[PDB]
Nucleic acid binder design. Structure first.
Lengths: 63, 198, 120, 50, 113, 332
RNA sequence: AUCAGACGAAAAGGUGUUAGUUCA
RNA sequence: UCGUCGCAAUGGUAAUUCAACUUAGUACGAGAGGAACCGUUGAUUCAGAUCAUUGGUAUUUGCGCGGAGCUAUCAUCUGCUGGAUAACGGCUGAACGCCUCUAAGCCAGAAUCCGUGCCAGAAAGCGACGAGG
RNA sequence: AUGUGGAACGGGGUAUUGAGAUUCUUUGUUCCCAAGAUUUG
C-alpha cells in the first residue's frame, strides 16, 4: 500500500533510505547481489500477508 | 479549519487567527504551519512568531485583523521583525498591560472585541482602536474561553476542541476562516461553521 | 503444552534457585510451587503437596533425605501437571519589507550601552 | 477488518514456499548439527526425544 | 503532553494561580523532587495532589540566553491530572514552560510571562 | 577516579599541549597546518543567537560561556623528516631554518645568559656557508619521508607574558605530497602564520591542553573535543569584540585587561566552553581528528554581543567609553 | 581435535571418520 | 655532558545512557495500537576539569564589604569510532548429478571482540637536533 | 651575567571601597651588576 522508493526508500513508508535483469559473468556475485537486494527488503514486526509485497529475484539464467 | 498543530489541538492558543493575519507562534509543526498556510494562510498570514518566546503566544496575542495590538510582553525584536514581516496595514501595537495574556483575556472578534472583565479600559480601548473592533470587558479569559471572530464562533459551553471549555484556545476563530483544532467535535465544528456562515 | 510448561518452569527454577541444606531444599520447593501457582493463575492439590513436602523437609536430618524429598515433590508436581529537524527556515524570507536587501540584513540592537533598536 | 481478518487477508510472500523447501532440505543437516552442538540438559532432552 | 523539559528554576508551597478555589497548592510530589517554572507537578492545596505548572517561580529562572528572572513567589497554577488547568483562570505571570506544559493553563492565565 | 581512562592520575610534565594524534592527511587535501598554539586569554560569556533547525531556541539569542584564546601567529623555523619504519616512526633528519629568534634559541638554554648563547650559531654558519647541505637534507626528506612536520616557535613577545623562551611545537603540515610539504615549509622558513590561516573559525577545533596544578590533583594533559570556534579575531582588529548587533567598536580586551594575563594585543580565537589549564596557558588548538558532522558544527556562528565587563575586579559596563557619558562628569 | 593427544557431566549424539565382518 | 623536538615496547580506559515533546497519532494498521523517523530540550549516575564571569572568598587586615587570586557546574566546559564476529539470517556449492548458510569459502549481523581515540609511557626504550681537549 | 637587563621602592593603573584609602603596571629613582661556588663533561 506504501510504495518503496528506489537507493531503497519509503519501504512501507520508511523515512530511512537504504541503497530487473542483472547480467554478469560472476554468477555467484550476481546471486550474492540478488540476496543483498532481498536482504535489503526485510520486513520488521510486520505480518507475512501484510509484508507479502517484497523484492524477490524472479529468475536467474545465463544471458 | 479544524487542524491541530502537531499533536496539540490548541490551534487558537498556538495561533491567534485573524482575518488579515493569523498570529501564529514559533515552535509549531512546520507542516501544521503549512496546513494553516493552506487553509487560511494566504488570506490571513500565519507567520509563526513566538511572542516573548512562547509557543502558545497565539493564546496571549491581542492582535486582531485590523491591528496587531499584541501585549508588550512580545519580544521587541520579534515585534520589529513582525512589523517588517507583516504588512503595515495591520496596526501593530504593544499593549503594555499587567495582564500580559491580553489575547486570552480579550475575545477580539474582528467585528467587536470582548476584553476581560478585569481588563484595563484604557488597554482595552487601545486594543479596540487598533483592532477596529469595539471592546467589551467581560472566565476572565474571554478570548481563551470563547473563540471570537467577525464571522462568528458561537460561544463556549460555560464548547470547541472536543468540548474543551477554552474554545478560543482550542479554536483559532478568524473572520476570513474560523480555524480550530483537529480534536474539535464534528457537531461543535459544524456549529462553529454555521455560526461563521460557513 | 504440559511438557513444555513443565520444562519452562523447571528451567526458570534452576535459573533462579543440615539446617542450611534443609532451607535450600525448602526454598527450591517454594520457588517451584510459586512458579506453578503463577502459571495456573495466569493447582490446589499441587500447592497442598508442596506445603506437605516443605513441612516434611523442615524436620530433615540428612542432605540425602532432603534431596530425596525435593525429588519426590518435583515428581509429584510433574505428575500433577501431566494429569525535519535539519531544514533551515529563515523568517526574513517571509517579509513585507520594501527593500529585499534590508530585510535580509540585520539591524543594530544595542550600541555603546544603549538599546539602538529600542531608541530608533 | 473483523473476526479472522488475517486469515481473510491470507485467503485474498510467495518466496516463503521456496524458503520452506530449502529449510526442509537443510532440516536433515540442521537436526544433526543441533544435536551434536547441544550441551547440558537440553542435549539430554533432545537425545531422549530422538 | 507538549514541549520538552528544560533546566530552569525549580520554584514550583506552589501558589495555585489557577482559579480552582485554592490560592496556594503545596506541591505534594513532582510529576514524572521539584518542578521547574512551568512544570506540572502533583500539589495538595495549601490554602483555599493535583498537577501544578509553575506559572510564577520565586527562584531566579535562567532565560534562553541565561537571563535569570525571579518572580514574586513560586506560584504553581493548578492543573487537572489530565493536563488541562484545574482552575478557571490562572493569575499573575505565566511561564513559557507552563504554556508548553498546558496551553489551557496559559489560556486561563490572565497574564503570560 | 571511577574512570580508569584517566586513572592512574599523574601530572603531565610538558605544560604545552602535546598532539599525541595528528589528523590523517592525503594528497587530495591541500598542504596546511593542523595545530596552532594559543594562550588562555579568558572565557567570559557572550550572547549569540542560535539558528538551528528544531532548536527550542531556533532563531533565539543565547548567552554562551565562550572562551577567548590569545593566538600570536606561529613562526615555522624548521622541519623534521619522519621515515616509516617497521619499529615505528623515526626522525630521518631535522632541517632547521637558517636564522632563529633569541626567544626560541633561549628555549634550549636553561639560563640564556650563561656565556655565549651559541644556539645554532655554527648551524647558522654552516647553513649559509653550505646551503647545498640543507638542499641535500631537504632532498633526503623528500626522498625518504612520509610524515613532514614543521618546527614552530611562539611569539610570546606580542603576548603580555613574562616568559621569554619561545614555546616550540612540532606542528605537522598535512595534505599534498611530502615534497609539497617540504616546499611549503621551506618557502615559509623564518616566517609567521596567523591562526586565521590555520583555522577558518567555522571549523570544529578539538583544542587540547594541560590541566592546571590544583596544588596528584590536576596538572594533567587533556584533549577537549567538539569545540567549534566562534570568532578568530585578529589583534589589529579593534572591532573583534564588536559584532554587527553591537556595532560600536570594542577591543576583545575588556576593561581591566585580562585576569592574570593582561590585555590582548594579537590574534585570538573565540570558542564556546572551557578548556583545561589556567589563564594565559599555551593551548594546542588543533584540527579535529574526526570530521564530526553534528548540527552544532553545521550551524554557523552569528555572535550577538561580546561581553567586555571588567576582568580582574568587577565591571558593570561593556566598556568605560560608553560609561564616561553614562555617568555624570567626575570630580576630575 | 576452535578444550587434540602425550596423563561422572561418559549415557548418548555425531550431514565425524578409518578399516573390516554379516546379510547382501 | 647539557638540552631541543619526536617516535611507542607496554598497560589502563567511559561515559551508562534514557526521557519527553515533535519526528506521531506517522506508514502500516477497519481501527486501536504503532512504525520508520528526526532534531531539540533536558535529565539518572559516574570521570577528567578550567576558577573567565558569578556565589563564597576573608591579614589586601585594604576598606559589613572585601581587592589580587583560590574553591565551588555555586560560573562553565565536559566524556570516540571504524572493522572483525557470536547467535541468527543469507550467497556460492559439494558431500548426497539436483538440493543443501557449510563441508572448501564469503557476506550481512550482538549491548560481544579487536583496533581507533583518550590517559600515561620503557627511573636502564629509542631517533633527529643544537652546544670535552 | 653590564642590560629596551632583573628586582625593590617613589608610585600609578586595575578593581576594592562607596568623600577617602589600598594593592598588575611604570620612558622615574635606586638596588642589583662580567652573580659566586659545586658538579661532571
Amino acid at each position: 500500500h506504501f510504495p518503496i522508493n528506489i537507493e531503497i526508500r519509503n519501504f512501507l513508508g520508511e523515512r530511512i533510505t537504504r541503497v530487473i535483469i542483472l547480467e554478469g559473468n560472476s554468477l555467484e556475485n550476481v546471486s550474492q547481489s540478488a540476496a543483498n537486494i532481498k536482504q535489503i527488503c526485510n520486513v520488521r514486526n510486520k505480518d507475512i500477508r501484510k509484508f507479502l509485497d517484497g523484492i524477490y529475484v524472479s529468475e536467474r539464467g545465463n544471458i | 479549519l479544524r487542524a491541530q498543530f502537531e499533536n496539540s489541538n490548541e490551534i487558537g492558543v498556538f495561533s491567534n487567527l485573524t482575518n488579515s493575519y493569523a498570529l501564529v507562534a514559533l515552535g509549531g509543526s512546520e507542516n501544521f504551519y503549512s496546513v494553516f498556510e493552506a487553509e487560511l494562510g494566504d488570506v490571513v498570514p500565519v507567520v509563526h512568531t513566538t511572542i516573548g518566546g512562547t509557543r502558545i503566544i497565539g493564546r496571549l496575542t491581542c492582535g486582531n485583523r485590523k491591528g496587531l495590538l499584541v501585549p508588550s510582553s512580545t519580544t521587541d525584536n520579534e515585534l520589529q521583525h513582525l512589523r517588517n514581516s507583516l504588512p503595515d496595514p495591520v496596526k501593530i501595537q504593544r499593549v503594555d498591560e499587567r495582564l500580559s495574556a491580553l489575547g486570552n483575556i480579550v475575545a477580539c472578534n474582528d467585528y467587536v472585541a470582548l476584553v476581560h472583565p478585569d481588563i484595563e479600559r484604557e488597554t482595552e480601548e487601545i486594543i479596540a482602536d487598533v483592532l477596529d473592533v469595539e471592546v467589551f470587558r467581560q472566565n476572565v479569559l474571554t478570548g481563551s474561553y470563547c473563540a471570537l471572530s467577525n464571522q462568528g464562533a458561537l460561544v463556549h459551553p460555560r464548547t470547541i476542541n472536543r468540548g474543551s471549555d477554552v474554545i478560543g484556545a482550542g479554536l483559532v476563530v478568524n473572520d476570513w476562516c474560523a480555524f480550530a483544532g483537529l480534536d474539535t467535535t464534528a457537531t461543535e465544528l459544524a456549529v462553529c461553521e454555521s455560526i461563521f456562515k460557513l | 503444552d504440559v511438557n513444555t510448561f513443565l520444562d519452562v518452569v523447571l528451567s526458570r527454577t534452576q535459573r533462579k534457585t543440615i539446617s542450611r541444606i534443609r532451607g535450600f531444599y525448602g526454598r527450591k520447593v517454594k520457588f517451584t510451587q510459586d512458579t506453578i501457582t503463577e502459571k495456573l493463575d495466569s493447582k490446589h492439590l499441587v500447592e497442598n503437596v508442596a506445603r506437605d513436602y516443605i513441612r516434611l523437609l523442615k524436620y530433615g536430618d540428612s542432605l540425602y533425605r532432603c534431596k530425596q524429598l525435593k525429588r519426590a515433590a518435583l515428581g509429584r508436581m510433574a505428575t500433577i501437571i501431566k494429569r525535519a529537524g535539519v531544514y533551515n527556515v529563515e523568517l526574513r524570507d517571509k517579509y513585507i519589507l520594501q527593500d529585499p536587501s534590508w530585510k535580509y540584513d540585520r539591524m543594530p540592537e544595542l550600541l555603546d550601552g544603549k538599546n539602538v533598536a529600542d531608541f530608533v | 477488518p473483523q473476526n479472522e481478518y488475517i486469515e481473510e487477508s491470507i485467503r485474498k510472500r510467495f518466496d516463503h514456499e521456496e524458503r520452506k523447501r530449502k529449510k526442509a532440505a537443510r532440516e536433515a543437516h540442521d537436526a544433526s548439527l543441533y544435536a551434536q552442538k547441544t550441551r547440558g540438559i537440553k542435549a539430554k532432552l533432545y537425545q531422549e526425544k530422538r | 503532553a507538549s514541549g520538552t523539559k528544560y533546566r530552569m528554576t525549580l520554584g514550583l508551597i506552589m501558589n495555585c494561580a489557577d482559579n480552582s478555589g485554592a490560592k496556594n497548592l503545596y506541591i505534594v510530589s513532582v510529576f514524572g523532587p521539584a518542578a521547574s517554572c512551568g512544570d506540572m507537578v502533583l500539589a495538595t492545596v495549601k490554602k483555599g495532589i493535583m498537577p501544578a505548572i509553575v506559572v510564577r517561580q520565586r527562584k531566579a529562572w535562567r532565560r534562553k540566553d541565561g537571563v535569570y528572572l525571579y518572580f514574586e513567589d513560586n506560584a504553581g497554577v493548578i492543573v487537572n491530572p489530565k493536563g488541562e488547568m484545574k482552575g478557571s483562570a490562572i493569575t499573575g505571570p505565566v511561564a513559557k514552560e507552563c504554556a508548553d506544559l498546558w496551553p489551557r493553563i496559559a489560556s486561563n492565565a490572565g497574564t503570560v510571562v | 577516579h571511577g574512570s580508569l581512562g584517566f586513572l592512574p592520575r599523574k601530572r603531565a610534565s610538558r605544560q604545552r599541549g602535546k598532539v599525541k594524534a595528528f589528523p590523517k592527511d592525503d594528497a587530495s587535501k591541500p598542504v596546511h597546518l593542523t595545530a596552532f598554539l594559543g594562550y588562555k586569554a579568558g572565557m567570559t560569556h557572550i550572547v549569540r543567537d542560535l539558528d538551528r533547525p528544531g532548536s527550542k531556541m531556533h532563531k533565539r539569542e543565547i548567552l554562551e560561556a565562550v572562551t577567548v584564546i590569545e593566538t600570536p601567529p606561529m613562526v615555522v623555523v624548521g622541519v623534521v623528516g619522519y621515515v616509516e619504519t617497521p619499529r615505528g616512526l623515526r626522525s630521518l633528519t631535522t632541517v632547521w631554518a637558517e636564522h632563529l629568534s633569541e626567544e626560541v634559541k633561549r628555549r634550549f638554554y636553561k639560563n640564556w645568559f650563561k656565556s655565549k648563547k651559541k644556539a645554532f650559531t655554527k648551524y647558522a654558519k654552516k647553513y649559509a656557508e653550505s646551503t647545498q647541505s640543507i638542499n641535500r637534507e631537504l632532498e633526503r626528506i623528500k626522498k625518504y619521508c612520509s610524515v613532514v612536520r614543521v618546527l614552530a616557535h611562539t611569539q610570546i613577545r606580542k603576548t603580555p607574558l613574562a616568559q621569554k623562551k619561545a614555546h616550540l611545537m612540532e606542528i605537522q603540515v598535512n595534505g599534498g605530497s611530502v615534497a609539497d610539504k617540504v616546499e611549503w615549509a621551506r618557502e615559509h622558513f623564518e616566517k609567521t602564520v596567523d591562526i586565521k590561516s590555520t583555522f577558518e573559525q567555522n571549523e570544529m577545533i578539538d583544542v587540547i591542553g594541560v590541566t592546571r596544578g590544583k596544588g596528584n590533583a590536576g596538572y594533567m594533559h587533556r584533549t577537549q573535543l567538539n569545540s567549534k570556534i566562534y570568532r578568530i579575531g585578529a589583534g589589529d582588529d579593534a572591532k573583534n569584540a564588536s559584532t554587527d548587533f553591537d556595532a560600536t567598536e570594542k577591543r576583545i580586551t575588556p576593561m581591566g585587561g585580562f585576569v592574570r594575563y593582561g590585555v590582548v594585543e594579537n590574534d585570538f580565537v573565540m570558542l564556546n566552553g572551557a578548556t583545561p589549564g589556567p589563564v594565559k596557558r599555551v593551548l594546542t588548538l588543533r584540527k579535529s581528528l574526526l570530521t564530526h558532522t553534528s548540527r552544532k558544527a553545521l550551524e554557523p556562528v552569528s555572535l550577538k554581543w561580546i561581553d567586555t565587563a571588567s576582568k580582574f575586579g568587577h565591571g558593570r559596563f561593556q566598556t568605560p567609553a560608553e560609561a564616561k557619558q553614562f555617568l555624570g562628569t567626575l570630580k576630575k
